[PDB]
């Protein structure tokens, strides 16, 4: 029910401390999340506790708020054909399933929560009045690279929320922080009138679907079943990443059929295995097991093919579903 606080104003000096306590009308159990209007000027500790300690740090007014929430159970819909991918950044994990948000887990947290800034887009009204709004963004895969986070096949919505799928869109966030995940995904920042730029390129290729992505020695390598790419990150400028076409026939099979082994990539180009160090590719199964793997994988479910770097014994196997299994099964049997 309605919440009230016995404290509404206070006078402090830099170096002095103060503690505020939140108390809702009912005596139930709820979750708390403190917020601040103007960043800085104060230091917080244990924001999830009903008693926060503040420390004046700089001059200026401020308006603190405490958001009480009655958390409840909620079931997801991550089917077998749309499982989790579980990237890693700053010791924090991510979920990144289809139909739902990536749902990062902070390092200093014990529960999963949606990504911060996910869906934020800067809007400027008449006379140049900026404002921010959140839209229903849904992704298919998320990974980490150059202290940033990426996204593939974004279902970017907008006002008049008939969703428009952009299977070639690819957004990148700002740099990481101390034991935290990125906090800005909006491309239309710096429009409120120097560093920390986010954006996209909207690639142009064949068959799209922008399924997979993986880094290699500071150079990204995008795969979409055809027309692979390369990512060249710059220090800081208008174009932080310039993507250049690499191949015309190469392209990964499934979203997780690639892995780095030795300054190279182990990819499945719809016809065989390739091992390219960059600008040159080879065939590890030219005329040895090609007709065997294509036959064994093309029968039941090729999209279930996977890989794993068995560095413990210098082996890289490509998991796939056995020959005799249901067409609706994704449990890899042979390797």
């Amino acid at each position: 029910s309605s919440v009230t606080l016995d404290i509404v104003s206070a006078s402090l000096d830099v170096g002095e401390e103060i503690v505020i306590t939140a108390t809702a009308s009912p005596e139930g159990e709820y979750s708390y999340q403190w917020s601040v209007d103007k960043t800085g000027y104060v230091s917080t500790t244990s924001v999830t506790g009903k008693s926060i300690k503040l420390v004046a740090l700089r001059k200026g007014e401020i308006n603190v708020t405490c958001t009480v929430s009655q958390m409840t159970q909620k079931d997801y819909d991550a089917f077998d054909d749309y499982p989790w991918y579980h990237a890693v950044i700053s010791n924090c994990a991510v979920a990144t399933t289809h139909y739902e948000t990536p749902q990062v887990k902070e390092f200093e947290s014990e529960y999963f929560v949606d990504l911060p800034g996910w869906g934020e887009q800067t809007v400027v009204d008449n006379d140049g009045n900026p404002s921010v709004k959140k839209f229903n963004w849904k992704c298919e895969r998320v990974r980490s690279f150059n202290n940033r986070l990426f996204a593939l096949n974004m279902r970017e919505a907008n006002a008049s929320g008939v969703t428009t799928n952009y299977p070639l869109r690819l957004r990148w966030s700002n740099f990481a922080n101390e034991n935290k995940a990125p906090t800005l995904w909006d491309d239309f920042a710096y429009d409120r009138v120097e560093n920390g730029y986010a954006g996209y390129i909207d690639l142009a290729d064949s068959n799209g679907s922008l399924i997979d992505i993986l880094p290699l020695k500071d150079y990204l390598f995008v795969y979409t079943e055809f027309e692979t790419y390369i990512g060249s990150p710059t220090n800081n400028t208008y174009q932080p990443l310039m993507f250049k076409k690499l191949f015309n026939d190469s392209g990964i099979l499934a979203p997780e059929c690639v892995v780095e082994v030795e300054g190279s990539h182990f990819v499945v180009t719809q016809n065989d295995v390739i091992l390219h160090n960059g600008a040159t590719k080879k065939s590890i199964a030219s005329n040895r097991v090609k007709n065997m793997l294509i036959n064994e994988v093309c029968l039941v479910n090729p999209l279930a093919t996977r890989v794993h770097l068995h560095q413990d014994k210098k082996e890289v196997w490509v998991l796939y579903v056995g020959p005799g299994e249901p067409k609706e099964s994704f449990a890899c049997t042979k390797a």
Binding site: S1, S9, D13, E61, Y111
Partner: protein, 150 residues
């Protein structure tokens, strides 16, 4: 890890090595068709993001008085020599003398029956005694690390 995982169909997982709440021990972040679970060889926990059905905000304003000019002040009469037993008053002001008070202290408080009395509002008076020597007058603030010298 526990007897509760033997009835679970996981779809993916990652070995998180550390966590603020966890000690220097690794754990797992495994997901299922509907939920996300965590196990650390001792117990199973569902850390799936929960949805907030109801939310209530609380307004709270705060005022931070200016910290400018509270830093070390400057002195007009950095030094002032007088005769043997003269009690010339002292005239000085801190940096804008705003938002805070000060405390006048003198080392070797033996150069007068009452060397420096408690300042009435902001300043106090000075006296002397029939003896020579070098001393220092520290005009210290209430508690902050601001210690001048005359």
């Amino acid at each position: 890890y526990v007897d509760e995982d033997k009835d679970l169909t996981p779809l993916s997982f990652v070995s998180m090595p550390f966590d603020y709440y966890s000690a220097g021990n690794s754990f797992l972040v495994v997901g299922t068709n509907k939920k996300l679970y965590k196990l650390t060889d001792e117990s199973l926990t569902d850390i799936s993001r929960k949805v907030a059905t109801v939310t209530k905000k609380a307004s709270a304003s705060i005022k931070i008085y200016p910290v400018v000019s509270q830093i070390v002040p400057k002195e007009s009469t950095i030094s002032m020599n007088f005769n043997q037993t003269k009690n010339l008053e002292v005239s000085l002001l801190p940096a804008d003398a705003n938002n805070t008070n000060l405390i006048w202290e003198v080392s070797n408080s033996s150069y007068g029956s009452i060397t420096v009395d408690p300042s009435d509002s902001k300043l106090a008076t000075l006296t002397s005694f029939e003896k020579e020597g070098n001393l220092v007058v520290t005009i210290s603030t209430a508690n902050e690390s601001v210690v001048a010298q005359i």
